[PDB]
């Protein structure tokens, strides 16, 4: 059996995944088995239960038992059929704190009088290390040339916007996450949430 | 919190230490940091004490590792560690036993029973969890 190809450990939305491509030899209804390294001070390849014999070309590698996201670790995949097992193919190391890719927040909007508050929230993997997330809110009139950007704000705090009573136009908000460990990582801006402003 | 530059310099040192470990034996007879070590398992009053003990051990091991080959890359990291240790000591106000006593005992014994390679590998791989997780829990209940 031809081993999986282009075996890659990557991060998306705060999580980690292993992906790959089928072996050079291209039999069918072949399955795949996946494993990961545990912590460097108690290392052992462990299998990912849910990916065992998968026919998919990826595997979630987040919040695994005995995983240590504070150090490098690799995943490995092999191709398997009844008629053979391929050799293992390892990924590069992935070092979560320095390579995780943040998702945009989901903004929660409340309004009181002339103050509109836009508050970031996130669905975070339960094992995630406590990252310092901040976010940057963009605000604008639908179709307008320029946008306004509010000061970068810590997860935990809302962004406060003063409304103009008479501006009953369709407006729009969006935000991205800034995650800075040793170098700033920016997520994309979230999909705009839009609404008709009305003060009284 | 720790600035991007402090964190970049820790990473450079952590990677250089990990490299040097590929070329020695660093088996440990017992885990230097107990496998379940986690300040969130301790009472708020106990957390600074645990944090201090791992910090002092970390400093002592990395200083002994800081030979002519590594002294340049370890200089910022040691300076930062000293400063964290001093800030922490300034805030530490001074019959069955629990996890805190057991863990301090394991830390205290490690330098007596284990090889230098073992102590270096153990503080090296514990370093970013110390800096990002343990330091954070303590800074919640600061006193
Ligand atoms: C804006 O949204 C954020 C969430 O993205 C809110 O911050 C979160 O607020 C909740 C409610 O108080 C906090 O929950 C609790 O956490 C504490 C700390 O462990 C715990 O003792 C309680 O049992 C409860 O689980 C949560 O910690 C906090 N998250 C943060 C700050 O990251 C915030 O309240 C919202 N602001 C608004 C609506 O103005
Ligand atoms: C696939 O892997 C091969 C071998 O390393 C490489 O040459 C090629 O650029 C990769 N392409 C994709 C799409 O992964
Ligand atoms: C991102 O991850 C969280 C936590 O696992 C999940 O609940 C959420 O649905 C994810 N969001 C996206 C855009 O897939």
UniProtKB/Swiss-Prot annotation, chain A:
Record key words, sorted: Antiviral defense, Disulfide bond, Glycoprotein, Membrane, Receptor, Signal, Transmembrane, Transmembrane helix, Ubl conjugation
Extracellular side: 1-200
Residue ranges occupied by any Fibronectin type-III domain in the UniProt entry: 3-103
Coiled coil: none
Glycosylated position list: 6, 13, 119, 146
Gene Ontology cellular-component annotations: interleukin-28 receptor complex; membrane; plasma membrane
Expressed in which tissues: Widely expressed.
Protein localization: Membrane
Disulfide bonds: 51-59, 63-127, 172-194
Subcellular location, principal: membrane
Molecular functions per Gene Ontology: cytokine receptor activity
Post-translation changes: Ubiquitinated by FBXO45-containing E3 ligase leading to proteasomal degradation.
GO biological process, one term: cytokine-mediated signaling pathway
Annotated family: Belongs to the type II cytokine receptor family.
Subunit structure: Heterodimer with IL10RB.
Entry function: The IFNLR1/IL10RB dimer is a receptor for the cytokine ligands IFNL2 and IFNL3 and mediates their antiviral activity. The ligand/receptor complex stimulate the activation of the JAK/STAT signaling pathway leading to the expression of IFN-stimulated genes (ISG), which contribute to the antiviral state. Determines the cell type specificity of the lambda interferon action. Shows a more restricted pattern of expression in the epithelial tissues thereby limiting responses to lambda interferons primarily to epithelial cells of the respiratory, gastrointestinal, and reproductive tracts.
Protein name: Interferon lambda receptor 1
Organism: Homo sapiens
First and last residues shown, out of full length: 24 to 223 of 520
UniProtKB/Swiss-Prot annotation, chain B:
Domain of life: Eukaryota
Induction: By viral infections or double-stranded RNA.
Lineage: Eukaryota, Metazoa, Chordata, Craniata, Vertebrata
GO biological process: cell surface receptor signaling pathway via JAK-STAT; cellular response to virus; defense response to virus; innate immune response; negative regulation of cell population proliferation; negative regulation of DNA-templated transcription; negative regulation of interleukin-13 production; negative regulation of interleukin-5 production
Residues of the full protein shown: 41 to 189 of 200
Glycosylation sites: 25
Source species of the chain: Homo sapiens (Human)
Family recorded in the similarity comment: Belongs to the lambda interferon family.
Gene Ontology CC terms, in alphabetical order: extracellular region; extracellular space; interleukin-28 receptor complex
Record gene name: IFNL1
GO MF terms, alphabetically ordered: cytokine activity; interleukin-28 receptor binding; signaling receptor binding
Disulphide bridges: 28-118
Name the record gives this protein: Interferon lambda-1
The entry's keywords: Antiviral defense, Cytokine, Disulfide bond, Glycoprotein, Secreted, Signal
Function description: Cytokine with antiviral, antitumour and immunomodulatory activities. Plays a critical role in the antiviral host defense, predominantly in the epithelial tissues. Acts as a ligand for the heterodimeric class II cytokine receptor composed of IL10RB and IFNLR1, and receptor engagement leads to the activation of the JAK/STAT signaling pathway resulting in the expression of IFN-stimulated genes (ISG), which mediate the antiviral state.
Location in or out of the cell: Secreted
């Amino acid at each position: 059996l031809a081993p999986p190809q282009n075996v890659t450990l990557l991060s998306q939305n705060f999580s980690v995944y292993l992906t790959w491509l089928p072996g050079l030899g291209n039999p069918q209804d072949v399955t795949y088995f996946v494993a990961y390294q545990s912590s460097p001070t108690r290392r052992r390849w462990r299998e990912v239960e849910e990916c065992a014999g998968t026919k998919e070309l990826l595997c979630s590698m987040m919040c695994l038992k005995k995983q240590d996201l504070y150090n490098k670790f690799k995943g490995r995949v092999r191709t398997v059929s009844p008629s053979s097992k391929s050799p293992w193919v390892e990924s590069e190391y992935l070092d979560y704190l320095f390579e995780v890719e943040p998702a945009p927040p989901v903004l929660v909007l409340t309004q009181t009088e002339e103050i509109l508050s836009a508050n970031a929230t996130y669905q975070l993997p339960p094992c995630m290390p406590p990252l310092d997330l901040k976010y940057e809110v963009a605000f604008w009139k639908e179709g307008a040339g320029n946008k306004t950007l509010f000061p970068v704000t810590p997860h935990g705090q809302p962004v406060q916007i003063t409304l103009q009573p008479a501006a009953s136009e369709h407006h729009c908000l969006s935000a991205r996450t800034i995650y800075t460990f040793s170098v700033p990582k920016y997520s994309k801006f979230s999909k705009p949430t839009c609404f008709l402003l009305e003060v009284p | 919190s720790l600035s991007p530059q402090e964190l970049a310099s820790f990473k450079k040192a952590r990677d250089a230490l990990e490299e040097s470990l590929k070329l020695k034996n660093w088996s440990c007879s017992s885990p230097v940091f107990p496998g379940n070590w986690d300040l969130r398992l301790l009472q708020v009053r106990e957390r600074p004490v645990a944090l201090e003990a791992e910090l002092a051990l970390t400093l002592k091991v990395l200083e002994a590792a800081a030979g002519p080959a590594l002294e340049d890359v370890l200089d910022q990291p040691l300076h930062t560690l000293h400063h964290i240790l001093s800030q922490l000591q300034a805030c530490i106000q001074p019959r069955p036993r629990g996890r805190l006593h057991h863990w301090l005992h394991r830390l205290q014994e490690a330098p007596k029973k284990e090889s230098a390679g073992c102590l270096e590998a153990s503080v090296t791989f514990n370093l970013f969890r110390l800096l990002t997780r343990d330091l954070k829990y303590v800074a919640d209940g600061n006193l």
